[PDB]
Amino acid sequence: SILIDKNTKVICQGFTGSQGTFHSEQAIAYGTKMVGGVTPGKGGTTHLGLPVFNTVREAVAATGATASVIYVPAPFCKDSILEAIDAGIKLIITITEGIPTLDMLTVKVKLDEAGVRMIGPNCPGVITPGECKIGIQPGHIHKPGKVGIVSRSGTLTYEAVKQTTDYGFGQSTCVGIGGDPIPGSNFIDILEMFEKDPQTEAIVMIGEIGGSAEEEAAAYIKEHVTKPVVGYIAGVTAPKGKRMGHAGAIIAGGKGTADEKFAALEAAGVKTVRSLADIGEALKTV
Amino acid sequence: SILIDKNTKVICQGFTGSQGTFHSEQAIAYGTKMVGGVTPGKGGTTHLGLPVFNTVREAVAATGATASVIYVPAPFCKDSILEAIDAGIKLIITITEGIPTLDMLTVKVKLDEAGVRMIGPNCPGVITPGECKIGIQPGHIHKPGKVGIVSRSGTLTYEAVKQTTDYGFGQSTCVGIGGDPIPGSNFIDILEMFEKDPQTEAIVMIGEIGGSAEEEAAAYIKEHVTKPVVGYIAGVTAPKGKRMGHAGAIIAGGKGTADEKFAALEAAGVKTVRSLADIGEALKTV
Amino acid sequence: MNLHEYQAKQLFARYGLPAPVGYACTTPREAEEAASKIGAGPWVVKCQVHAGGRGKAGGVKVVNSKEDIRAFAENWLGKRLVTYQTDANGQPVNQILVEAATDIAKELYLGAVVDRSSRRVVFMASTEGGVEIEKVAEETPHLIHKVALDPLTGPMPYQGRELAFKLGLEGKLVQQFTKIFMGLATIFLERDLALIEINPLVITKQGDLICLDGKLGADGNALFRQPDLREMRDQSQEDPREAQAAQWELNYVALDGNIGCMVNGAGLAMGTMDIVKLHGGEPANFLDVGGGATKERVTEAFKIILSDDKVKAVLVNIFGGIVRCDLIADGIIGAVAEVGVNVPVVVRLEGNNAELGAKKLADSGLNIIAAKGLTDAAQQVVAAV
Amino acid sequence: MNLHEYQAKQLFARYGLPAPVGYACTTPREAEEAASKIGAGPWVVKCQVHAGGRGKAGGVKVVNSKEDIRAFAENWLGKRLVTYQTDANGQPVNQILVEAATDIAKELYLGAVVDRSSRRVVFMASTEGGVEIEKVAEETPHLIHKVALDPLTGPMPYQGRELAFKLGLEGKLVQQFTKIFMGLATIFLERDLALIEINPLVITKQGDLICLDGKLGADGNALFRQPDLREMRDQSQEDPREAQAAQWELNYVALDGNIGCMVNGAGLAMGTMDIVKLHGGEPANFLDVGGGATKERVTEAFKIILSDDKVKAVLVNIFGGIVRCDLIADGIIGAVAEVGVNVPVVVRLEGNNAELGAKKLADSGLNIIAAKGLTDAAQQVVAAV
Ligand SMILES: CC(C)(COP(=O)(O)OP(=O)(O)OC[C@H]1O[C@@H](n2cnc3c(N)ncnc32)[C@H](O)[C@@H]1OP(=O)(O)O)[C@@H](O)C(=O)NCCC(=O)NCCS
Ligand SMILES: CC(C)(COP(=O)(O)OP(=O)(O)OC[C@H]1O[C@@H](n2cnc3c(N)ncnc32)[C@H](O)[C@@H]1OP(=O)(O)O)[C@@H](O)C(=O)NCCC(=O)NCCS
């Protein structure tokens, strides 16, 4: 498993909001170790049984949490990511969609300089089937197992989760890297973790149009990944030039098409599947 | 010797200016390996026999220089430091006095992130008696030898240079860290170099009022410096609250006085000398 | 979102960057009165649409008399201009730009975009002005120089001189180019843009730099903090269904196909259209249900999709959500009767009550086919059509 | 350089930060007309000098009638106010600030400085308002909270709320404090300041924050890019000799002593006065020759130093330079005759022609003593005096 586990103590920034409440009730159900949360102004209260603090530092000194999940609207996201990092959290998982790209540009530089990890933004989050759920995914589809999944899309991840469960494989850790143009973690940061994960026997890598990370990964895989990777790319039928729902989903400059990416995955010796329906199958074969 | 040597190939940013011309003629005389220089607009010409380029990158690709000395007026300094760093120079020596502190604040952060070294600003520069002179100091006072000097003031350095030459010791490398509030290199970055320098047998450390670096060094010495260090601090008679010529020379907040610093040097087991005239003497004794 | 030329130009003016003197006009009367406010001609008259390739399409002319102004304005105002970058319908020209003609000595290219690969804003310059920069990259990629703004420091003049020199500019033009690099980088940052393209940036017969064309793209996600820019959007330039879809939290993009896809998830919607393509179908659109598949939301989605009339069957495909698979099947069954869909709908539900829901669908009696899995769902519509 | 209170307040206004309504006045007529422009009294009248400790010195009073306004203004305009932070002469009060009196519920302390140790701008807040923050640090250092602006990101609101909470503020005041933290950090950065001290920042009986006092320090080195701030300097608040010295590229600071020091190098000048102190002397000033020791520059230096009349001997001490040790000795010998120095001058020259130069001095016949080394030079003046 990578990133999170039965031991990760987590706080929620945006705890008393709609999504913050909702999806925190589910993590709690799941057995996730939510130790408390943050909403400025509401400190001193208690929500879902957990204590609510005024500033992330207050929360961290009180609870010892090292991870944080952020359900704060775009306009204040960058301030809440920066606060978290400044308070000594080492893992940030941001669900928030709609963050301005330039806000992300700077936060990423700070993330890296400070060595803090962010999953997201605009992402379903993270699950280690069996121990930890932080995110919005429906946990009843998962099963503790040996495949690790990284995706650039949420529901698309659920298709693969449900195949690898049905074919009996299950999952080490499912990771959604988000659909924005500049995410806090790319494929490479994540493939490197899976490769080093013993519970991880094969890797499912789901991507889509736009950018060049899949390509960038195609080439890191070839050189540094020894487990088998089955890759699927959504987008082949996408118009050139339009944003396909996800903010980073757009073929900009006649560049970053579905077909280029499949084609670069093959070379790296990746088992590209051209029908999302065959992820189960192909892994069976691996 | 530290930092520079008979092999360091150097370029000058501000080459065709008054000070740039003057002090470049002297380095050249000294045997310093000036390989060329930069003045935007004057590229394609030649000055003091050396080629003049339009951008520091142009100069670096042409000559292979790894050090640069900057004689560009305050208003454009930060842009010229940033250019140098971006063009792949690893050692910057800035003479320029009058740089706004906040310009220095940001440049320092960039220096450190990029691992480039700056000596200065507002400093006499650097000399390895015998091989290299970059700076404004009068080279005829020096003598190749075994004492290493770091100072927060220029002419004050000349007093010690001239004692250690007369007492027959001479110098490994003389380093002026500048008199501004936020220099690109402090005492500690430099003591660490001398300590590791075999040609360096004892260290002369000259400081003055304001800041707390001497103190910060007093405490690094105690733990990590095994050669003998003789320390002198100029300022004892300074009024509290006024800037004493150097921009960083001011007792701000009744803090950073001459006496505190002597007192913190003693503890570290430093041979404080209360008369600048006895630096020669005290080292004789060490 | 995109800006009109005349709107970029006016921003350039606010920041002190050079552009020709020009007027944006809405009636031919205004277009021919501009002639004498500008000067002696000749003049350039230009159709204002968001798309490129206007020059080639006839939407840009140099003219010699007020009479020819009035004539261009009369020939275009209210028409749709179709350019190689617009669709079959082109875009409505509701505005003409009349500016002073320019004495072109040389044409350069100055642009900036956010480089995903480096995670930086990157300005690119080149000597091949008046040409799709895409062609120049694959073709003479060495004829393009770049710099990258540093987030800690903001744009700096050495970056601007650096590029000025690379372009072989010398003298007052180096500084002139520099100021223009400083101003654009600042507009970029201050207004949350996503794209700048000055093509051509022109050296005049008189030795000055002047941005001749201007093409801005703002970042939709920052509009919450760019009120002025919020106000400059021209809806008329967009497929109205897209904006209509967004009001009900959906993400439509229309296409050329007989098969409709309603899915929850942009990644899933794309995977779904690809699965339909792959089994011989031709998807007619991307639709990504943003809010939970409520009845009312599900209904809208039907309207939008079926607004296109080449549509032959609808594939709905829903994996998960905050609405129970049985509740959606109701909404669907409902939408179909009330919106009056007369096309077969194949539906893949997957989640809670999936099986229960697929039974309500089947029993309904309507022409709604419950697929047994996705690959099945694909094959049936393709078949249905 | 320092700003007056009334000048800080006016900047605060430009950035939207709260301060009392007040008028800066130059004649008592203006001071008493302010009463009714402000409102009902009572009112606060305050002497505008750069120094602190005005309250204690009598330079700040609350008053109840226009008559008392006119009386304070008449009693101070043109006088020098001496505060525990000014010298023996105090500073000229050429301006009185008349503002509305304030309903003080609580007094906090908000300040920012450039922290050399961390190389960051650091804002410090505390609940002990109305007190020298120096006392509070050594005394109850835990009663002070700090944050540090990040250069990459600029001030952020979590830093402002963070501190609001630490001060125990809650509610609208947390946000109010936050806005004030955001505005000051921006003024700091945008105007190249070196120091901000709002003491006290006051919570009013009505529940709002208001900066009651304001004390700004700009960074001299940036004035080249702060034109407005350049214009706000009050020379009258400075020793005129310091500004006079700076015109001729010198760095004077006067002191209480009988012995003058003219040296080239701020580090050397300080080392020299310490060497003179150390051998029983009392230095009367710091003087750092900025430009080469030319005759004309050397002369000025004499005037400045000897402007003080407790001066008993002058120690000149020059190690190095772009002027040959013999040329300076001429300039000196010259200065002495032409400026008419009637005090012994001991002179240590060191460099090129040092020995040659010390001979011109000796032969001169004037009362100029050439020292044989620095320690010697010190002993002789101390002796001379
Ligand atoms: C982030 C998002 C979930 C917030 O929506 P919401 O919960 O509906 O919003 P609310 O206004 O209800 O709650 C936000 C909370 O943040 C709090 N808040 C604001 N700024 C904050 C800060 N800096 N620190 C902490 N909390 C903050 C608000 O005060 C609010 O809680 P409150 O009501 O108790 O005051 C919504 O913007 C969003 O991004 N939706 C899309 C999610 C998505 O599609 N993700 C992709 C996954 S594949
Ligand atoms: C830096 C300093 C030496 C410049 O003074 P100068 O040489 O008298 O100034 P000039 O104007 O004569 O020369 C500066 C040169 O920089 C050039 N220049 C300007 N910006 C530049 C840039 N970004 N890159 C390169 N060169 C630049 C100028 O064009 C000029 O050369 P030019 O005349 O051929 O055009 C002066 O500001 C200074 O700092 N003096 C104090 C030095 C000192 O006391 N140091 C402390 C040591 S203890």
Side-chain angles (χ1 to χ4, degrees), chain C residues 87-332:
Chain C
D87 82 53
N89 313 333
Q91 267 160 325
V93 158
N94 292 96
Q95 230 152 163
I96 281 324
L97 181 75
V98 181
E99 35 175 44
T102 287
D103 271 312
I104 306 163
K106 217 220 242 150
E107 292 168 319
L108 326 168
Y109 173 94
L110 192 61
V113 305
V114 177
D115 177 72
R116 284 227 237 173
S117 179
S118 48
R119 315 201 294 298
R120 275 310 174 300
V121 174
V122 170
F123 271 83
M124 290 160 248
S126 147
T127 56
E128 314 313 275
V131 181
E132 307 170 26
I133 195 68
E134 298 185 358
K135 302 228 168 119
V136 177
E138 84 191 5
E139 250 209 285
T140 106
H142 58 287
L143 287 192
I144 302 201
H145 324 292
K146 321 198 174 94
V147 293
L149 314 175
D150 178 338
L152 167 63
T153 65
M156 296 276 316
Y158 78 77
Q159 312 193 271
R161 273 186 241 130
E162 167 147 304
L163 284 180
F165 292 130
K166 285 162 140 172
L167 293 155
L169 298 190
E170 62 184 296
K172 74 182 191 85
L173 284 178
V174 158
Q175 349 239 290
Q176 256 184 20
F177 181 101
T178 295
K179 220 200 81 125
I180 290 180
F181 156 95
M182 279 316 255
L184 287 178
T186 296
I187 293 180
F188 198 98
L189 294 174
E190 269 190 13
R191 306 325 245 234
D192 280 298
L193 304 182
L195 157 138
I196 294 200
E197 174 153 54
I198 316 286
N199 192 348
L201 167 69
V202 138
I203 291 135
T204 64
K205 285 288 184 57
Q206 312 62 66
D208 300 302
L209 285 185
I210 195 213
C211 312
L212 216 74
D213 220 312
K215 128 134 209 165
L216 295 204
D219 161 25
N221 287 7
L223 291 175
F224 75 80
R225 52 177 187 205
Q226 305 291 338
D228 285 357
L229 272 210
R230 214 192 291 155
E231 292 292 342
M232 306 180 209
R233 148 180 245 130
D234 183 3
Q235 273 292 346
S236 103
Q237 288 320 277
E238 296 150 31
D239 175 319
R241 293 172 302 189
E242 296 178 27
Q244 162 161 358
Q247 230 148 19
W248 267 95
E249 271 152 281
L250 320 160
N251 284 320
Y252 190 80
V253 173
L255 276 54
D256 311 323
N258 48 9
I259 297 152
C261 307
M262 164 167 356
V263 184
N264 62 321
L268 202 58
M270 281 181 269
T272 309
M273 325 162 97
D274 287 342
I275 189 100
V276 162
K277 181 52 235 132
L278 178 83
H279 281 109
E282 222 70 56
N285 83 291
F286 158 94
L287 176 27
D288 152 33
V289 182
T294 73
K295 187 192 54 98
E296 290 85 356
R297 190 169 330 305
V298 158
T299 303
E300 277 316 299
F302 271 112
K303 331 251 287 261
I304 281 97
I305 298 175
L306 303 172
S307 72
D308 178 13
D309 276 74
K310 288 136 187 98
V311 177
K312 271 0 165 182
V314 190
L315 174 51
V316 170
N317 166 28
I318 301 228
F319 192 127
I322 51 275
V323 212
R324 262 164 350 158
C325 281
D326 63 292
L327 287 180
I328 281 164
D330 268 359
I332 302 190

Side-chain angles (χ1 to χ4, degrees), chain A residues 14 16-19 38 40 42 71-73 80 95-97 122-124:
Chain A
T16 49
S18 296
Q19 298 300 290
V38 181
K42 277 162 193 203
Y71 292 89
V72 190
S80 66
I95 309 307
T96 296
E97 179 272 353
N122 194 15
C123 81

Side-chain angles (χ1 to χ4, degrees), chain B residues 124 153-160, chain D residues 263-269 319-320:
Chain B
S153 42
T155 43
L156 223 196
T157 310
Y158 310 168
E159 290 299 323
Chain D
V263 184
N264 62 321
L268 202 58
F319 192 127

Side-chain angles (χ1 to χ4, degrees), chain D residues 41 89-90 110 119 145 181 194 239 252 255 274 290 298 310 313 318 342-343 353:
Chain D
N89 313 333
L110 192 61
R119 315 201 294 298
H145 324 292
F181 156 95
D239 175 319
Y252 190 80
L255 276 54
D274 287 342
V298 158
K310 288 136 187 98
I318 301 228
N342 319 130
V343 292
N353 290 350

